[PDB]
A paper describes a structure:
For promoter-specific transcription, RNAP and general transcription factors (GTFs) are recruited to the promoter DNA to form the pre−initiation complex (PIC). In this study, we determined the X-ray structure of TFEα and the cryo-EM structures of three forms of archaeal RNAP, including the apo-form, RNAP–TFEα binary complex, and RNAP–TFEα–DNA ternary complex. The structures reveal that direct binding of TFEα can shift the clamp conformation from a closed conformation to an open conformation. Our results support the universally conserved mechanisms of transcription initiation in all three domains of life by showing that direct binding of TFEα, a conserved GTF in archaeal-eukaryal RNAP systems, can open the clamp of the stalk-containing RNAPs.
After screening derivatives of TFEα, we found that the 13 kDa fragment Pfu TFEα (TFEαΔZRD, 1–110 amino acid residues) was crystallized. The structure was solved by a single wavelength anomalous dispersion (SAD) at 3.2 Å and the resolution of the structure was improved to 2.6 Å with a native crystal. There were eight molecules in the asymmetric unit of the SAD structure and two molecules in the asymmetric unit of the native structure. The TFEαΔZRD structure consists of the N-terminal eWHD (residues 5–86) and a long α-helix (α5) that connects the eWHD and the ZRD. Superposition of the globular part of the eWHD from the 10 crystallographically independent structures (average root-mean-square deviation in α-carbon positions are 0.369–0.589 Å over residues 8–62) reveal flexibilities in the wing and the α5 linker. The conformation of the wing can change about 24° (~13 Å), and the α5 can be bent at ~21° (~12 Å) for the eWHD. These results show a potential structural adaptability of TFEα during the transcription initiation process.
Author numbering: 8 to 109
Write the structure that this text describes.
């Protein structure tokens, strides 16, 4: 599960912890992950949005009926996880191709 090697490049130990706990749980809210990990709830959100732009996490949106506002259930995005992996392999090869051109 080379997923952790990427998350680490975005936001270090905290990001690796968030993915591992999300991986352990399957799905989690922003607040649920903050309690599990001890990271400020504000920081988990930047992670998740960072992970979302890195295409390693997606979500489905549920509407909280008490407040009328939405909250997200995060998940690791395995639909694009293999594509993200595949791009990383391709980027490394392209780095090698430039060397053969040295």
């Amino acid at each position: 599960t080379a997923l952790l090697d990427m998350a680490r490049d975005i936001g270090g130990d905290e990001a690796v912890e968030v993915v591992k706990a999300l991986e352990k749980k399957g799905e989690a809210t922003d607040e649920e992950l903050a309690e599990l990990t001890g990271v400020r709830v504000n920081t988990v959100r930047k992670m998740l949005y960072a992970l979302y732009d890195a295409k390693l996490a997606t979500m489905r949106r549920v509407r909280d009926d008490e407040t009328g506002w939405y909250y997200y259930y995060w998940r690791i995005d395995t639909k694009r996880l293999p594509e993200v992996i595949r791009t990383r392999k391709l980027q490394e090869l392209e780095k090698l191709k430039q060397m053969l051109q040295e």
